[PDB]
Amino acid sequence: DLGKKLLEAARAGQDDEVRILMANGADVNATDASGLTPLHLAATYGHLEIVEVLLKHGADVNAIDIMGSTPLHLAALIGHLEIVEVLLKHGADVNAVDTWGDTPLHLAAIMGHLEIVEVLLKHGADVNAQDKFGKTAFDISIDNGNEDLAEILQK
Amino acid sequence: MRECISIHVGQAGVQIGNACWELYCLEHGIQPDGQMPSDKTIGGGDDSFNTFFSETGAGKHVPRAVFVDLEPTVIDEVRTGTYRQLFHPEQLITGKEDAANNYARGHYTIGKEIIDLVLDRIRKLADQCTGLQGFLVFHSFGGGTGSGFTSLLMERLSVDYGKKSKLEFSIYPAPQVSTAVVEPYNSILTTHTTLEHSDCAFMVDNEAIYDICRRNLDIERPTYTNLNRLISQIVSSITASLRFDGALNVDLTEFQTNLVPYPRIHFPLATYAPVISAEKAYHEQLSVAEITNACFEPANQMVKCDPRHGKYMACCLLYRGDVVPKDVNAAIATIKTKRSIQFVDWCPTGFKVGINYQPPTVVPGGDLAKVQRAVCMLSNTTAIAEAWARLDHKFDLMYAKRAFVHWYVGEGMEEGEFSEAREDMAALEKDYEEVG
Amino acid sequence: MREIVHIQAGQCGNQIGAKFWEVISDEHGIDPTGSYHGDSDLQLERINVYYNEATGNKYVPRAILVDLEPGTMDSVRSGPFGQIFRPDNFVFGQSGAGNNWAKGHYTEGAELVDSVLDVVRKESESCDCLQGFQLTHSLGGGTGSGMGTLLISKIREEYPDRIMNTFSVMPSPKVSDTVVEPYNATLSVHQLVENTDETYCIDNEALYDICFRTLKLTTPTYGDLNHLVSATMSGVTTCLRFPGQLNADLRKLAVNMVPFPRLHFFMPGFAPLTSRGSLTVPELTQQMFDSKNMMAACDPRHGRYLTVAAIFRGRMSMKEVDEQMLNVQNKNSSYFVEWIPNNVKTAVCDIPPRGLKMSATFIGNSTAIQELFKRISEQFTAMFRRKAFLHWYTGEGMDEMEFTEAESNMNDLVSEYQQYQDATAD
C-alpha cells in the first residue's frame, strides 16, 4: 500500500521518496482516516517542492477532508505564502467554505497573515463571505481592533 | 488614685499614642527622660497623674502604656524619637509581618503568633498597679492590625480582667487619607466582635479632622502629623479628668454612668472649640458663651453627622482655662432656648459641667494657637447612627458581589462571619431608631 | 515583608529581565560591578527588596536565570550588567524547547526543574522576611511558557503562603508570526489563572502598535519593544523600591487590586511614551487613562475599571495630583464600577526615572482585558479546529483533553469579566 507511505513522505518533506512512490503507482489522491491527502499534508507542513510535484501528477487541488478543509485553507491558516500562490495558479477555489463557514480569507485574517490576505483579495476572495456565526473577515478585523488588517480589507 | 493602662495597636494607634504621650508630658511637666521636678515624692506617690504614670526609685515617670504592631517600622520611630527613653523597652512589641489590611490576618493567623506575648507584657504592667480600673485602647478601624488584632486583644482582656473597664479611641476611615479598599469590611468586622467587650468608644472620623485642618488651620493638604496633633489635643481633653483633680468623669466607671445609658449605644460624639491657627498669635480671645455655642456647630465635631437630626441622651461639658462657673450657667441657659436641642423623654435635660482652671497646653511645632479657654463637649446623640449608615452602605455595595471576600476566607475566617457582623450592624442601627 | 526572589526563564524572560536589572540598578545608584555610587539615602532605604548585601558592600541581585537553551547565558553575560549576577544562579539546559510548551512543561523542562528549585531554596533561606516571587517570561514560546508555569506550580507547593507575581509577555503575529504561539499561550493562561496572585499582561500587539503608530518606528526591533517593557517594569515596582507614604508590598497590592481570585490580570500603562535616544500633572493623568498608552491591546473605554493603582514620579504638588485624579474619576465615571467604593489609589514618588522629570504609571484591573483573551482564544480555536501540529504536543505525553480544558477555562475567564462589566450596584 504505497498510499500510506506517500502520505508520510509528503508530510515529512521527503522529495525523493515522493518521486519513487509515484513512479511505482502510489495513489497521489490517497486519504488518511480524516480525509487528508498528500497535497493537504505538504501544504500544511510547508513543503513547496512536494506541492508542485503533486500538482504535476494529478493531485486534486480542491480536495476536501472530513471537515471541508481544502489545501488552500490549510496553507492560508499556517501562513505559507509561496504555497498559497502555487495553489491559486493551479486552480484552487479562493472562496472554498469549510464546515465552520470559514474561507481561506477568514483564516489568514484571524492568524494575522497580512501578505496572504492581500494575495487572496487580489485573486477574488469574497469580503462579504460570512462564517457560521455571521462574521466576515472585515467583522473579525473590527471586533479584534486589528487596524492594519482593516486598512487592507478596505483598500 | 486608680491606675489606667493605655494600649496602642497598629500604625494609627501607635502614631496617635506618641502624639498623646508627648502632650501628657508637657501638661504634667515631665521631661523626655522621665524626670519630673515638681514631684516632691520620689519613687512613688498617689497623685492624680500617677493614674497614667508609674515611678521608679530614680524618679523616672514611666507611662503605663503598651505599643503593639505586627510590623516594626512605626514602633521603630518611637524607639529612636525624642521620647525614646520615656518608655519601658519591653512595652514596645513588634512582629515581622503585618496583617496586609486584612482583619482575618490580624485576628486569626498572624495575630495569634504574638497574642500571648502581649498579654504577658500587659500582666507585668497590671501587677505594678494597686487598684487597676481598666484600659484605654487606641486603634484604627481600617487597618488589618487595628481591626483584627484589636478584636482578639479585647476578647482576651474580657476573660483575664473581667470586672475592669475598657474604653476605645477608634479611627473611622475617610477616603482622602485611606490606605485600603477593604477598610469598610475591616471596620464592620471589628465593630461586631468588639461590641460586647468595650464599655465606651470615642470614634474619630478622619474626614472630620481633615476638614477642620483645612478650614480652621489653613492646611492645604493635611498629613497624619497635622491630624494626630489635633486628635491628641482632643484625647487629652477627654482624659484630663482621669489625670487631674476634678469633679466630673473622675474614673472609668463614671464615663459609662454619664455617657452610656444602654450597653450597645456606647459611642459618644466629641466636639472641641476653639481651633485657631498658630499664625493667628494675636487672635481676639473668645468668651465662654462663644466657645460653648461652637459645641453645637456640626463643623467642630470629631465625627461627621448632624445632631439637629437626632436626640440627646447625655451631654457633658469639660472646660479648661479662664472659665467662671456663672458664665457657663448663663451660656447654657441661653443654649437651652434653641429649637435644635432635643433630649429623649426618659433622660433629664441636664448638662453636666466640669472645669479645670489651667488653659490647654500647645506642643512646640504644632498648628494651634495658645488660647485662654477651651471646651470639649461629649454627648450621646442618636445622630451618630448616620456614621454607621455611611459605613454599612459601603460594606453592602461590595458584599452584594462578594468582592474581596476570598482574602478573608483564605485566612482562617468563615464567610458566615460577614453576614453575622452585618446583621449586628443592622440591629445597632435599629437600636438608635428605637431610642429616636 | 521585604525580600523578593526574581526568576527569569527562556529567551524573552532573560532579555526583559536583564533590561529590568539595568534600569533599576541605575535608579538605585548601582554600577555593573555591584558598587554604590548614588547621591541619595532614599536609593538604599529599601535596596534589600531586590538585592543581597555582600563583601565590600557589594549589592548582588536576588535573581535566578533559567533557560533550556544554553546560548542565552552568554548573551546575558555579555550585557553591561552581565557580571553582576551570581555565577551559581545561572541554571541552563543542553537543548532549547523549539517553541513547544509540552517540552518545557513535561520532558526537557521537567528534568531541569529540581536544579532551579535548589537555587530558589538557597536564595529563599537567606531572606529575613521573604514576601514572594516575581517571574519574567513570554507565553508564546516553550521554555518561559511551559517551564515557567511548571516552576510556578512547584514553588507554589513549597511556599504556599508567599505571593507569586509574573510579568507575562503575550504573543502577537505582528512581532512573531509562529502559528503554535496561541497554543502555548492558552495552555499557559490555564496555569496562570490557578497558580499566580497577580500577573502583569505585557502584550506584544500593544508594544508593536505603540512603536509603529505612536513612536513612528517603521521596523520595530526587540530593543524598541523592551524599552517600553523596562519603563513599565520600573514604574510598577516603584512603591516596592522607594519608601513613600505607603509601606507597599506584594500582598497589600494583591488584597487591594484583586476582588475575585481568578481576575488577577492587570493592564499596565505608562506616560509619557518615548522611543530610545529621542508634561504637566493634568496631561499626565489624561495620557495615563488613554488606550494609546496601555501595554495590553485593549480599549479601557470598552470595559469598566474594577480597581486602579496609579504612581506619579517626580517633583509635583500632591494636592494637584489629588485634584486631577478626582477630576478623571468624575468625567470618566461610567468607566469605573460603582460597587467598589474608593477603588482608585494614588502614590507619589520623589525620584523620577532616567531621562524624565515627570512620569506616571498606571495599573488597571479592567474588564476590557477580555479583548486580549478573546484575541488569543480566536487564534487558538482556528488552529485547534483543524488539529494543526497537535502531534508535536501529544508526542511529548500531552493529552488532547488538556487543550480542551485550557480553551474552556479561558472562555470561562472572558465570561467572568463580562459578568462584572454588566453588574450594577442597585
Ligand SMILES: Nc1nc2c(ncn2[C@@H]2O[C@H](COP(=O)(O)OP(=O)(O)OP(=O)(O)O)[C@@H](O)[C@H]2O)c(=O)[nH]1
Ligand atoms: N488619624 C490617623 N489615621 C491614621 C494614621 N495611620 C493610619 N491611619 C488610618 O488608619 C487606617 C489604616 O490602618 P493602619 O493603622 O495604618 O493599619 P494597621 O493597624 O497597622 O494594620 P496593617 O498595616 O494592615 O497590619 C486608614 O484609615 C488610615 O487613614 C495616623 O497616624 N493617624
Ligand SMILES: Nc1nc2c(ncn2[C@@H]2O[C@H](COP(=O)(O)OP(=O)(O)OP(=O)(O)O)[C@@H](O)[C@H]2O)c(=O)[nH]1
Ligand atoms: N517583548 C519581547 N518579546 C520577546 C522577546 N524575545 C522573545 N519574545 C517573544 O516571546 C515569544 C517566543 O518565546 P521565547 O521567549 O523566545 O521562547 P522560550 O521561552 O525561550 O522557549 P523555546 O525557545 O521554545 O525553548 C514570541 O512571542 C516572541 O515575540 C523580547 O526580547 N521582547
Ligand SMILES: COc1ccc(/N=N\c2cc(OC)c(OC)c(OC)c2)cc1O
Ligand atoms: C485600589 O486601591 C489600592 C491599590 C493598591 C494598594 N496598595 N498597594 C500598593 C500601592 C501601590 O500604588 C498606589 C503600589 O504600586 C503599584 C504597590 O506596589 C506593589 C502596592 C492600596 C490601595 O488602596
Ligand SMILES: [Ca+2]
Ligand atoms: Ca511621686
Ligand SMILES: [Mg+2]
Ligand atoms: Mg500597619
Ligand SMILES: [Mg+2]
Ligand atoms: Mg528560546
